[PDB]
Symmetry: T
Subunit: 165 residues, 12 copies
């Protein structure tokens, strides 16, 4: 005979170890990137000429974390999500169709939402990596969390609000 082929529902979704949460990051950072690109492209209104370019800067920073976090996952022996289907299903951020009729304030507020989520994800990754004693991974999350939180201050300040982290 032969070993039976197991048929069960996709197991994961529980952020229990460093590996798990690094992959969740790969997923969320890929979608974040896509949301950022849509804001870049669909943006209209006073303040476009400053924020259009800014989205590029954010995107590059997000790219940087995406790469180092999946590559840390690889180094630790894991297997990073690497298809749009994987990214789209494992991510907790929702995507919507691009729309040109959104005010600047609403765009910036959407980016703050995404940044708040990512900062909590990196907080979770920090805590998990600390508990498991994976100090390298721990530092990666902390660094990413530092600058995301700083971007949240600035965005909120443009919106006339405190960071409210």
């Amino acid at each position: 005979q032969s070993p039976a082929e197991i048929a069960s529902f996709s197991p994961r979704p529980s952020l229990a170890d460093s590996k798990a949460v690094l992959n969740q990051a790969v997923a969320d950072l890929s979608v974040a990137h896509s949301i950022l690109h849509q804001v870049h492209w669909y943006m209209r209104g006073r303040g476009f000429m400053i924020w259009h370019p800014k989205m590029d800067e954010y995107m590059e920073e997000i790219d940087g974390y995406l790469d180092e976090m999946s590559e840390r996952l690889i180094t630790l022996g894991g297997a990073p999500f690497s298809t749009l289907k994987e990214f789209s299903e494992n991510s907790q951020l929702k995507e919507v169709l691009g729309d040109y009729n959104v005010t600047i304030e609403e765009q910036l507020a959407r980016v703050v939402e995404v940044f708040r989520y990512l900062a909590a994800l990196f907080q979770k990754g920090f805590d998990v990596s600390d508990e498991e004693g994976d100090s390298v991974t721990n530092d990666i999350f902390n660094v990413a969390k530092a600058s995301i939180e700083k971007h949240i201050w600035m965005l909120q300040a443009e919106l006339g609000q405190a960071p409210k982290l």
Copy 2:
């Protein structure tokens, strides 16, 4: 001459670009209102690009055996663009609206340049207009976006 018209539209461009530069200088200088700090330096970027086209088009014309307009009287009399005196009381959005309008004219100019030069088989001149049109159109998108509008080319 086989290339008489390429020549004529290149020189039209020389005149209109010189006028366009002038207007962008006026916007840069007379600008007042929230957004000054971003748009004032942006006019410099536009001017540098307009300048780059003015030089390239005039010199393509020289290369083809033409005599480019090279006096303010010539630019002025030949250009289809109309200049008005500077006024500090124009709003930032009216200033950007004017820039979009100058740029729309230039896109149509470069379109005609493109067609005429494609007609006469001057493929170098064709490319020059094609590159200029491409850039100007991108600029129109951005300006319109800032104005809360679609590019509407």
Copy 3:
């Protein structure tokens, strides 16, 4: 796919999928040649992002609305992604890259054809430049694999 705006948006989806695949090759790569090709994938991706931005933004300039969600990229792209696997050779990785680049070169030909018919010379040149470059890469990638470009 019979106007410039549809071909451009199709390119948005396909370049987005091509970028994802190039990333997968970057990460899962193993074997002799890794030290040269792993970094090369970043060059390829920087380029693909280059075109993605220019095309999407040409569409916008032309009054279109780019695919801008993963669902849209995935469903609209003609490219097929598979799960990442470490157990693929460098030569196999390269061959996959060439397949994708071949697909892109052909998409760029259609964009070239369609915009030429429509008299949209700006879009036409964007497709033209992207093609010249994709084609150069296939020559080089095929050469590493000991084969002619076979365009």
Copy 4:
């Protein structure tokens, strides 16, 4: 013999030190549309202000003087008044505050220009003139953002 020149140099040291402090408060406490342009702009202004403070302090040293060099001295000799940071100053208000400070500095620099000319200190004179040039350009730009004429 260069006593009036020395006094105005040192007065500028106090004032520039306070001005720098105010720019730093505006930079941190800024909130509202245009933050993203004006926040970094505050660094540009601070660098320049630091540039003058150092240059003028060292011109004073070079003349045989002794520049104020403590926060107490800066705060007590300066004519500018500082206030507790407040996040609810609007952008426009923040810009108007920088304008008030720059106008003060332009007038201080005028006085320094005049006094150094009177004492025949031509090097000190050109130092104030350069500073004045650039400050007035900044007032022109600030006021333009505010939709106003430079009003020098």
Copy 5:
């Protein structure tokens, strides 16, 4: 009010705009041995003319004035005369036109200098001083190519 400082700044705007046009004509129409050096040199002169033009107009704005800003205003106010482009002018003759334009500029800047000195406009006075220094150096140089003394 600095009425004449403003008047000379605006005269400079007009004349530099015409000077710039004249240098462009020389760049384009130039033919003869020396072309390869002087053709590009015309770009360097234009960039410098451009610099003054923007600095002077911007100093005018800063002072409360309203710079000339249309080609008609440039032509009607400039003292410089423009002629149609001709390819049959020699290099030596082109260089002679430039010297003549620059001798004019240097005289204009002397007036700008004298007027701003007199009105106590030291910033403007420096702007003119810097422009005149540069222009006069160029004159020495062009004259030297032409085998002649600067004859300032």
Copy 6:
């Protein structure tokens, strides 16, 4: 100094005064070594400026309100300023910088301690980076003075 915010604001006050002392040192310096040590103060000042901005901004980020007036810096800082004097020797100037730095090293360790205990990991690493560089500067200044770092 009740928490992370409190210590951040203390660093804001102390870094401001520390920067002022450094400028005093830069300006009133005389003696053999001037030519190396005078410009070196500029390097120290840029670094202190950097910590000052980063720490105040971390405080902003966290919902605090940084000291931002000279009175506030002066009031809250634990460093004491004295009038400039040209007759201080170069090695005496370097010793005052060492004292100021040892003070800032201590401050930053309290900062590190407090943030660690509160779980403010970003603030923690900020004080740690600051601590590392100051302690290296102490080693180098003490070395110049013929002494061990004596942390």
Copy 7:
């Protein structure tokens, strides 16, 4: 694509010979204006070399086999070479570069036409870009020589 491929290879022959002529002009130049024109041949040579590589590599990408020996170059090229001679005037050497450029400009027009007929838009832009630049140079050289470009 036989005709596109043939004109590309022709250009390889002729650009290799043009390059050698420029190198001769560079070395054998004597007369007033040497100091401006001697380095200018280095810029011309650099640019010629860029076309040469670009055009044979295009040919490779198309599945051709570019001429690649001095024999192939001399035999296929329509340019004729003469022994070096220091007795040539500066103006004479410039006229010889003008002649050679006028020739390449014509060849590039053939290449452009042929490629346009065969639908090879990529080769077509390559010829178009080379021709834009050679013609600018001819204007400039002719102007140094007191003449209209006469294209």
Copy 8:
């Protein structure tokens, strides 16, 4: 108090000096397909190694310690063993040798991390961490070229 941290820092000075010797050996004796990529890559590794060895040695000095600083000290104290150069070794063996050196450093740097953590030396702790992060990435890449998992 900080004796254990000082001890591991000094161990690292020793092992890093030998490591760097081994990389230089690889660099010079390398032969085979891939020489052209890997030979200069050893240079990257050496300079990164030199970087850690200076940082760590200077952190030891800063703590009041006395770094090993003679070839005899390095050899005696290093746990890494050196062998004679041999051109006959294969590229893949050369790379396997670099991996085994790095796996050792990574383990050493983890010991440093742990020791310094227990002692409260947070600066020393962060130096090992950054070192460890870097080396582990290198092991992944080196293993990748050899067709293997990182096995960390």
Copy 9:
């Protein structure tokens, strides 16, 4: 090859042919290693071009008349060219380069010796620097081919 002048001109001829051959290797290359060795042929050609210019120009300085036509290069060179072929393996290409370089080193040695005996120190230095560089390359290429330099 009687004297310094004569060997300088000989090198102009051989360096021209060597550059030709390197370019052939750059273009016709196929197989694993292409991605590192294709661009490596650019660094080599660049270097060869440096020597060729320096050597001919030293000869002009010396009052000679450097070869300046492809006919002179081809007829005077001891190096021999073959038709381009895609079927040559990477290692064969690499070994071709080695053999050209070995010839060049031997030529430069003769150039060194000849200018030495004529007391032309400048020409001597030129051949020395050229030699040291080529031998370094020979070690490196041989290393790739799994062999000792065997000078």
Copy 10:
């Protein structure tokens, strides 16, 4: 009409050439603790002296003058005195010597400033002013190294 401006420019050309010569002696014959920083510093001072000499020489040409241009002219018209190099001179003495030279030049630039101001040559006046500022700053610095006030 411009004779005194031309005179003091040409006197500066001579003194600047001798001063360059002196600084090069100091550079070469220097020995003593402090060499490693003061040796390269003399290069910086020489480049600056060179800049003034070229600028002032060329202002003189521009004005229709004829700069001193031989070592014999420089040596004979200079108020500065040269002696044979000697390795025994201490570092303080070397530095005190450069100060004396700088003091002379600063004074010479003051005469130049005065004279051009009288003759209304504002461009020449600015050149002397700029030169004077920088030299006085270096005097402060060298005096400070020497443990002293600038005592301008």
Copy 11:
């Protein structure tokens, strides 16, 4: 044939390795006025020494030799002696030690020159020549700091 050229090149590998290690000890153990200038200067020396070390071994490889490549080999073959690091050495003593090292290396490089001169290995000969020129420059400078003649 080239056995003696190879042998001295290999002597150089071992000595430059030990020279580098002594420079590193000097860099780490330095204490005294001058530290902030001389500490970085040891880095520059170390860089230059590595430069020679890599080039000489690679020249050896190129010639068919096998360079020393283990700390054991460097130690055994070097004629330089190493002692434990001591903080209580003065800056002047530390510099005198470098001067001793360099004096040795320049004697070595002269032997390398003469040997290769004899064996007609003109490339190896230029390498030693370049190295010697540079080391002798540094000996002049270090000695000048020490108030001494170069005394080659």
Copy 12:
């Protein structure tokens, strides 16, 4: 036993200084078609001459010598003779003057080369060789401009 190498090094210091002065005169006094190119070209030559002067003097110092270091010493030991600057001299005459100085220098570097070969001073030999190579290349270029062969 080193002494003639030192004497040629010192003659070079004198002649290079004089040559630097002559090039400066040509820079300033040049008039005529070609000015715009040859005027800046003199700068390049002067920077190069200063390069040699400094390297040669410092090699002399390194050898335990005492370089000429006053204008009088340069003037009286130089074989080159200076004349009063004159504007009327043609461009072609000026270049010929530089050619004549460069031929003197190449010949002097040849004597330098030979004397240092005989004395076994390889470092100095190499300095003269390098200088000679570049001077000869300039003669070619200058001669080419004047429509002549180099005639070395």
